[PDB]
Amino acid sequence: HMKLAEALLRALKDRGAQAMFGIPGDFALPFFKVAEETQILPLHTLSHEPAVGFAADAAARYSSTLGVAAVTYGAGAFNMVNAVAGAYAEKSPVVVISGAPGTTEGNAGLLLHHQGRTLDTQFQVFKEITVAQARLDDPAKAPAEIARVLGAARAQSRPVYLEIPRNMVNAEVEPVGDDPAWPVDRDALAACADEVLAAMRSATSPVLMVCVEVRRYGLEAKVAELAQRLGVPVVTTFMGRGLLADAPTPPLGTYIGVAGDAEITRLVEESDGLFLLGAILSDTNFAVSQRKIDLRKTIHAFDRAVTLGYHTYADIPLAGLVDALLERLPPSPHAYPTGLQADGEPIAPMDIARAVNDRVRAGQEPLLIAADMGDCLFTAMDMIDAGLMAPGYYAGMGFGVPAGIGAQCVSGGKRILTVVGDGAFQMTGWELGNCRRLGIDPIVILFNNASWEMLRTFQPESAFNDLDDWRFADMAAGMGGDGVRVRTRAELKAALDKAFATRGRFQLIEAMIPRGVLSDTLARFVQGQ
Amino acid sequence: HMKLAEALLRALKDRGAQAMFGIPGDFALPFFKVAEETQILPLHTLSHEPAVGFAADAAARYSSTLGVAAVTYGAGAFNMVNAVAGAYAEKSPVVVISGAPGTTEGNAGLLLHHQGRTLDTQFQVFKEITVAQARLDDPAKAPAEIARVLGAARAQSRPVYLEIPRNMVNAEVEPVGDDPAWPVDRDALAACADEVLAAMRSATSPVLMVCVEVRRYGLEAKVAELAQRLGVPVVTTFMGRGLLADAPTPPLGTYIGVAGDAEITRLVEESDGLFLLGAILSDTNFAVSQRKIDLRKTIHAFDRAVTLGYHTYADIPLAGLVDALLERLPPSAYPTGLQADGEPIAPMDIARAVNDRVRAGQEPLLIAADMGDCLFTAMDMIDAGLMAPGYYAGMGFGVPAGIGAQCVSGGKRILTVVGDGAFQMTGWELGNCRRLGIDPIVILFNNASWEMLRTFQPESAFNDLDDWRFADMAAGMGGDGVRVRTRAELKAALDKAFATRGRFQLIEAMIPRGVLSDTLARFVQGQKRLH
Amino acid sequence: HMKLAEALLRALKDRGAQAMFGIPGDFALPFFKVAEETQILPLHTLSHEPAVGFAADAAARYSSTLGVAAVTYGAGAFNMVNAVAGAYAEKSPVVVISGAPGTTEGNAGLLLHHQGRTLDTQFQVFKEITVAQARLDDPAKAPAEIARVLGAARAQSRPVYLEIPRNMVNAEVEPVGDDPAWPVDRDALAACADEVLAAMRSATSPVLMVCVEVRRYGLEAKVAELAQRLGVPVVTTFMGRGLLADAPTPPLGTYIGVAGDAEITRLVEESDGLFLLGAILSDTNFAVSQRKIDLRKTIHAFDRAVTLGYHTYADIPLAGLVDALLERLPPSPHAYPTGLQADGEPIAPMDIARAVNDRVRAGQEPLLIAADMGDCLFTAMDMIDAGLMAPGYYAGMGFGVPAGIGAQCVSGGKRILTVVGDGAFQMTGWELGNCRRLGIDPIVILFNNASWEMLRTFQPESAFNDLDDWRFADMAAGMGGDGVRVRTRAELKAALDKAFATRGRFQLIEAMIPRGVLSDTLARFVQGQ
């Protein structure tokens, strides 16, 4: 036997969790107390719950494991609905742990601070944005519930929800067992793999298109081998940008329809054997298509199913399929913008892409990139990376900075490059004030165009997309980092070199960008939509 | 523009409805008044709501069309839940029409007679046993709703629910248009047909097994042609007994595993190309198997889907698949000898009697059977089709079904087989024959017992029933009854029943307790294994 | 420990159940086996499930206790929805026990005979017509579930639902404990009783109107004492006809608005202190009011609440209130149609009322009366009785005959008088064929007018209300009873005398009644509606 809170933390750690992010409240104090005193999982606090969710999500994307977000009842949990809905959409297994009233509280005739219409209102809301839930209000059942919920998060790669009455944190329970098993029919898998391979082999111009699930289930290496053995080109989706960064043979590029490279777009759209491997069928990934794409003519492996030839194979895990394909195969690109003119001219999005890329070509091992939504994301699309995480489908802003924070918190010393615009920084960039206590020194390039540019690009006439010029670099000092505003390419270049040479605190390079000055990609992308 | 009730009755007739069965109640009197006056559909009344449902259901089964059951709010509707769940389970499109309180009633601080906990309670209940429902409380929208709902009933071949406030019965509305269109992807259909056909051709011993949907969608003639072009034997499921009764080449037989003909069973379970066409995967159809059949290795077309090779093709209508297959293909013993002596009557003697008449020239009658040894015996009868609750297995279906079918059979007589247990539930409906202008022949297997249950658990006393003199009670209901105890009397009684028209003919056959068809005996043991 | 089925039967018996009615099916065989071999509760089978429900309901109304109805999965249970919905409406605590597939059945890839869309479909349907439900699929929990469900049936006086997987019938469990307790605030009760008494004392013409709950909770004797101590007249509702039959001072009559006695109607409608004690606020009870009745000006005690003076007292049990009123009070009629002319003239409804009433006045102790819906009920309204049960609010037909059967099954030798019309007899009158095996000999007076008269009375023009003339008396013999058709008052009188003098089998007096010939009450009642 052991305390329930302790059994839970150990169960998470046993399943790969590397840390726990959170913000306490009276309902969660007992649980945080156990998390801090046991130190089973490193405890990192943030300033506002959205960042807690985003960071757990990034830690999960970074290591392809479970992310852990702990909050208090109501004020905490409801403040994380947006980040969780986003993790659900982009299939990131974030474990939401919320404190709640004790099992005997609420029967005094009084309404309790933080509750919704009913004490169960919060549970009801999270049912909508998670794949499994459990209220750990029965010691006898807790272990099975925990294994069931965490088991679901790992299999479905989506968020789960655990509610812990505060009087149960220290209740004695048996250790948590293994995840329930999800049966897989060997004959179905065999047949599916046989039909998929045959479809790829009969195609004249086959294309392997990789997306999120490839990372979620840790299949990047195996999938590079599959492309290798099949002898076909690999292209990522917009959502899947950054996949196979460590592959001996990198993908040919990223498919962005009318907004991406013309040859990749033609290769993808004219393919008679397009294998959408673990892809989200989103507008962001396919609405930008120049020529209407017939999804029914593709091979689609997603959500533990495989569809092709107008029919679906149920209960087929991506990992199982990849292994099955490999077993049947015997052993055995778009240019990056470069050459930045570090002079006295104004900074444009692509100049930032060039600066980054030039240091790498010059010898700097690339950095994993965390990106927020805005032109910063369409610009990162042309950056050299060691992986990339961004809200490519949910597209909610605020992800960038806390994602870089969460990822670096578990990166074992490797720095994370963060790209975010002024609108997004206003929302959550402030979380950087926590870098000192957390012990990380991310490099953040803030695209300051004093505007919600993407929206102006969408509806140029409106005035509400105008924003003041916040002196983000001047405020960096107050949050404990080094901030520098840059207006010229030479200042940009120099600032970037200083940032990389300076560790110990966050480096905010505030890049002044004129309104109307965008990356090549964004413009066309918007019009495509 | 026209009255809602009238627009509904026309929409029902436009879709093949042939009659409306029902029992009235104050909340429905208006609706019934219109029906009676407009005569858009013959209005047949019965004694108890369960029969209303079964008859409407039998009528839909007989003509492969919609069935219409009209009842009153609460006391009427709720009393039909069992028949509707059964029609749902057995894919019969029964259209339930219920009278309801006026759109303004129930706002005087008072509860209304017949209502459930809430006025919407009945609606919530029916959502569980219907594929679509609609409360016709908006004249502007009634037409389109009638269309959506009746269309779902037709496409999915299951029951639907229509709730009519009594102050809406005579409300002006536009006429009802066509059902919405469920467009089928031609490319998917093509891929599906090609794969199914390839599988059938690569099999060395293919078998086409037909079940309910074949009749529901009126595909019997096309399936018989399909089998011919494919050159494959046709077998029915237990539920499908009676299918292709009027085909040039009838099915080889009916599969019932350990309880059926050993040859048919062998053919079915050894097949490397078992095509389950419109089949319900029920314990009644397959838990009888000699050896567990691996259903994932069959070709299964059911509920607008087609599964084979461990994958499924969604949105593929059974009729669409049959036609697709036919476009890819170029054209190309019953028990007898009743010994009419003084020996007691056993179930099989009854099949022999029925079959000898057919062999001597009698055109076979369609059979309506209830659940009990009557059904298992009917498995051995020559028929012009047969309807029974072979999956839901709910008793009481027998007599009402026979009645419902004969009401729409344009003169053809229906033979009904039923046990004493089931007759006690709905056999009494025969008292409506005169008024309905029908005279069905009813063979009542009377063993003073719930014999099928005794077979499951012989040690129990509660299966011993009293002896009711059903034949003696026939007269009071307007029919001719005769109780038979010997095989000779059985034979005489049957000839007289066929020779006598104008009144329903009831032949009450006394079967000794503990005497049951081998089929029933083996079926029960077969099912027991599943516990 | 003991077998679950056995624990359940004992729990029912401990709570007053006197019998179990049912029809088996393979899913329920194991349970019926236990019921028959243990004989904890006498087992009575019927022919069709509707009668099972109606009979359980009557047994419950008869002894003011729990009624027990046992059926098989699907074909059995769904066939009882109407009788159960009726018991729910008229507040009769019928315990529905249904057999179901074993906990491990249904996982073989096969659909199971009797199931609805899903295995849980039946459970879902019964939730709509019961106050509590439980699937006894966990031996550990079974005892608590049983006590919770049966506890709810007794407190709320409505049907409950128990589903028993067949593989659980013989599972070992601990004996069932007591019902969970439903707290009652002493101060609230005290205040409520004080305000009610004061309202009755300040009224100039107070009227105590009794309805169903008075019988359901066994308050007839105590309520007669209350009227006695308060010094006020007692009138029943239409639904409550038959209440206080054993009261030293019988009620003044039954309130049926424009369809009842004029003086009772005036007394009720002009009352400044109308106490609706345990009444159903139905159209059948109040829509017949001559003068619109302001329910808000009344005192209403129903469903564990009391409303008066535009306000409601929650959680006030009727029994508690009656006891409270009694504690604050120190110690201390409409004529019956009679004189039947037993001559050669045709039989009319009221003649039947007179025949019955004359035997009683002549010395025959009245019989409890079971009535179906139709003119038979409006006629029984003018009969002398030892109590009366009828679907006075739900108004569903088919209740009559099986109700008389169920009641007599638990009447300990007392005969039950049943009144039913031809339409209703066609539905369930056939259940009489079971009287011999069950050992009862009810007297049944069938009003044969070859018609659904009530409906013709409602819409005279229609032809579909015409019915053939079934020779019910001629068919009685086949069901093992004595049947006699009567056309003249002299035949009626004589038939009734023969019936009472003949015990050993059911006596069916088929009274031929001309169409259009009704009781006085029905005509006006219909027009009132």
Ligand SMILES: Cc1ncc(Cc2csc(CCOP(=O)(O)OP(=O)(O)O)c2C)c(N)n1
């Ligand atoms: C939580 C949330 N609220 C609003 C929006 C809607 C939006 C999509 S893009 C954008 C403008 C972003 O301006 P930014 O300075 O960050 O970068 P840039 O456009 O290149 O100038 C907004 C407000 C989203 N996606 N999420």
Ligand SMILES: Cc1ncc(Cc2csc(CCOP(=O)(O)OP(=O)(O)O)c2C)c(N)n1
């Ligand atoms: C509405 C309903 N309630 C109970 C049952 C359960 C049952 C299945 S079989 C059977 C006995 C039938 O006796 P019967 O005399 O009719 O025929 P036979 O067995 O050959 O003697 C019962 C009670 C079903 N299926 N449906």
Ligand SMILES: Cc1ncc(Cc2csc(CCOP(=O)(O)OP(=O)(O)O)c2C)c(N)n1
């Ligand atoms: C289950 C159910 N279905 C229909 C109805 C609707 C109805 C209310 S009254 C009546 C006619 C009854 O004729 P009966 O011969 O029984 O007695 P009488 O009218 O005096 O001639 C019907 C059909 C109800 N209430 N319940």
Ligand SMILES: O=C(O)C(=O)Cc1ccccc1
């Ligand atoms: O601890 C919290 O989350 C709070 O909001 C503080 C608090 C605690 C109890 C009542 C009101 C506020």
Ligand SMILES: O=C(O)C(=O)Cc1ccccc1
């Ligand atoms: O999740 C994303 O946003 C991705 O693009 C996938 C990914 C995540 C982390 C490193 C590389 C790719």
Ligand SMILES: O=C(O)C(=O)Cc1ccccc1
């Ligand atoms: O018409 C019906 O369905 C009835 O049950 C008759 C009725 C109508 C109004 C109140 C009570 C009974």
Ligand SMILES: O=C(O)C(=O)Cc1ccccc1
């Ligand atoms: O619906 C049934 O019970 C069947 O067995 C199908 C059927 C119905 C009518 C005639 C032939 C087959």
Ligand SMILES: O=C(O)C(=O)Cc1ccccc1
């Ligand atoms: O026992 C019952 O309730 C039945 O309906 C009999 C039965 C049992 C198993 C399959 C089909 C019918």
Ligand SMILES: O=C(O)C(=O)Cc1ccccc1
């Ligand atoms: O429940 C009813 O129908 C009543 O009228 C109440 C009643 C029941 C049994 C005996 C006396 C009164």
Ligand SMILES: [Mg+2]
């Ligand atoms: Mg901006």
Ligand SMILES: [Mg+2]
């Ligand atoms: Mg029998």
Ligand SMILES: [Mg+2]
């Ligand atoms: Mg009548």
